[PDB]
Every structure is written in structure tokens, then in C-alpha cells.
Design a binder for this molecule. Sequence first.
Ligand SMILES: CC[C@@](C)(O)C(=O)CCCC[C@H]1C=CC(=O)O1
Ligand SMILES: CC[C@@](C)(O)C(=O)CCCC[C@H]1C=CC(=O)O1
Lengths: 218, 211
Amino acid sequence: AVARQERAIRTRQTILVAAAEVFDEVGYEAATISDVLKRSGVTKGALYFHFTSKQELAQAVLAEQVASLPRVPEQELKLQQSLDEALLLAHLLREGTGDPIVQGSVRLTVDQGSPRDHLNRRVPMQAWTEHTQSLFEEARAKGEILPHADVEALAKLFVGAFTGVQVLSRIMTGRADLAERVADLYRHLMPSFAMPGILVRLDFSPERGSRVYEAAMK
Amino acid sequence: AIRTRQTILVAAAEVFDEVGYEAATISDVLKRSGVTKGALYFHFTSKQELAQAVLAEQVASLPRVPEQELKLQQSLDEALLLAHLLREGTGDPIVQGSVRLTVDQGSPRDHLNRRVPMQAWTEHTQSLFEEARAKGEILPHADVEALAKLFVGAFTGVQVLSRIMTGRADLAERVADLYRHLMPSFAMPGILVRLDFSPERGSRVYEAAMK
Ligand SMILES: CC[C@@](C)(O)C(=O)CCCC[C@H]1C=CC(=O)O1
Ligand SMILES: CC[C@@](C)(O)C(=O)CCCC[C@H]1C=CC(=O)O1
């Protein structure tokens, strides 16, 4: 029983990682259960214990998007935390290795599909919006945000802007410039709402990005 | 014949919007455009060539906003116009489908070059920011290329989020938020206050652009 549940945990992750990969490579519609079976090396029995259909598997990779980012060390500035997360996500989307679910999950999110596929792409977008607003809320309690800033509007701006920065970067450089583009984004958004005292202390450097990455990989 | 090429282009874009590139067919396009097989094949050899042309026509499809002395306003006018056109469709029936073709990842096997509209938007936005900079609307040494990339990128994402969350119902608000929040990082003194974000202005811009 104890061993059965440990196997169940590991098997689900194995499926999710393999499924995200095939969804990344070929998209939702062209992907098959067979592709995922070939990639994971799990049995057909194992896959159906965890997921009911391709659709429900796709939904799960969508739903695990936010939970996929390694949690950054809890720190002094909440807006530095947001920057650290965004730059880590930029690294994870270019490299893939540190989190093999995100690339595929983002592709499923951003591909339009149709109402016919019954995928709920709002799921990860809502979760990122909540994630981001929550961090702004904590930043505001810690005196990091200007008075009368709309933290919901701001959260929606950050999620949307990040998404499109990602898209443009994917198209133009295959995400090679993504960390630089994300840094640029944060440098031009933060001045509208971050307390000036916080703004001078924020660290946008690839060296800090590198250290956060090295830390998150344990 | 040029108008027949456009009728086909509009129909192809709408078909690409509805069902995507892979699922779409010449037969869908012919049904939608109501042109003969001969008319289509004179202008395009394949679905692939059709897709490349609606991708290519993206920037040019955007109706020209009236020239403005405040160049930042001109950009805002364009941004809010494009928001409006992406939400409704009727004033630029090409753009919805062209955007889906740009944003959908597809595969390197499809021979579609998504770089073409993105490069064109970047050069367009860069030119405006050069004019803005020279007229003293933005910081004299602002990296106008990086800003263009930032604006094209951020707009695309705001668009994508709005489509997913509201079907683009909130797009104009979200684009306004984008411009309002990016501007203080690089605008010259007294410029941000001069900008007009109102939907009444947006409406006047829309009308003039169609005329
Ligand atoms: C702004 C930075 C951060 C960490 O707080 C996010 O909310 C990340 C948003 C990621 C959204 C994801 C969905 C589509 C896409 O391209 O990326
Ligand atoms: C920033 C405002 C503007 C007018 O100057 C643009 O460049 C618009 C960029 C349009 C990009 C297009 C591709 C995907 C998408 O969602 O929209």
C-alpha cells in the first residue's frame, strides 16, 4: 500500500512530463496516446489508471503549469521575488531541463484550438493571475507598492505581457533572448507602481538569475 | 483580379481563424470566398502559399490612423484600433486569422514563417518611437529598438490573455493599461498627461481610419 502510492506519484509525473513533451512537439490535435506511451515507456494500463483520455491528460498538463515552477527561496523583497520567478521561468522555457512540463503546458495554453476541443486554457492563466496578485498583495503589505495601485489590473498586465514577450521571443530567436526580454519588461513596468526605494534595490542581472537557477535545482 | 485575390485572402484568414492551419482546406476557402477553382489557382498554388500571404498582409491590413504630431498618441491610437479590430473583426477581416497563424506554434514541417509579421510590427513601432524620441516625447537616448520589441511582445500577450479570459471583451482596457503602465519608464515630462485613452477618441479614430 505505501509502496503502491509512491509508484502512483512517480508514474503520474512520468506520464505528465512525456505528455507535455509530445504536446510541445506536435500540438494537441496531432498528439496521440500512443505517442505518450512511446515517450514515457509506461504501460497502457498505467496511463489509464491516471488519465481517462487525451483531453483530460491535456487538461492536467495545463493545470500543473504554475505548480511546475521550482519555488524560489523566500526573501527580503516580494518584488525581487516576482522578478526572480519571471527570470527563472524564462530560463526554464528556453532550456526545458529544469522543468520539462512548462514548455508543453505553455504551448497548450497559447495555441488557440477551438471550443470543440473542450480544453480549459483559462485554468493556468487564472492561476498565474492569482499567483502574481498574491505576490503584489504581499509586496503592498511590506510597503513595496505605491498607494492606489490596482493589484488585480497589475497582475493581469504582468501575466499577459509575460505571455507575449515569451511568444515574440519564441518566434524571433527561439527564446534565446527571452531572459533579456523579460528583464526589459520588468524594468519598464516596475517604475509605474514600485516604491522608488524598492526600485533601486531590484537586481535584474543574469548573474543573480544564474544563482537563483542553481539554487532552485535542489 | 486584385480584388479577387483579397476576397480569397479574407476567406482564407477566416477559415484559418475558425479551424486553424492544419485542419483548414482549399475546399473550405473556396466555399467561403465563393470564387471558382480557376480564380483561386491563378493566385495561389497551395494552402501553404495562402497562409504565407495572410501572414505577410498583417501589418498592411491595419487601417492607417490619422497622422498626429504627438507620436506616442499615434501609437496609442493604433494599439486601441488593433484591439478593436481583433475583438470584432469587421473593419479588418484579415487580422484575426493572421494573428492565429502568427501565435499558434504549428511545427517547422508546416513551412510557415511567423517571423514575417512580427518583424514588420517591430520595424513599424520602432519608426514611430524614433519620431517620438526626436520630437522630445521620450528620453533622448531611449533604446528605441528594445522598446519596439517590448511593445510588440507585450501587446501580443495582452491580446492572448484577453482572448482566453474574455474572448477579447476586455482587450481595449487591457491595452490601455499596458500603455499607461509602460510609459512612465521612458516618457518625457508632461507627455503622459497629454495622452488620450478615452473610448470616445477611439471611436473617432476608428471612423476616420475607415474613411
Ligand atoms: C509575470 C511573471 C509571473 C511568474 O508572475 C507569471 O505570472 C508568469 C506567467 C506565465 C504565463 C504562461 C502562459 C502562457 C505563457 O506564455 O506563459
Ligand atoms: C504595440 C502596438 C503596435 C500597434 O505598434 C504593434 O506593433 C502591434 C503588434 C501586433 C502583434 C500581433 C501578433 C500577434 C498579436 O496578438 O498581435
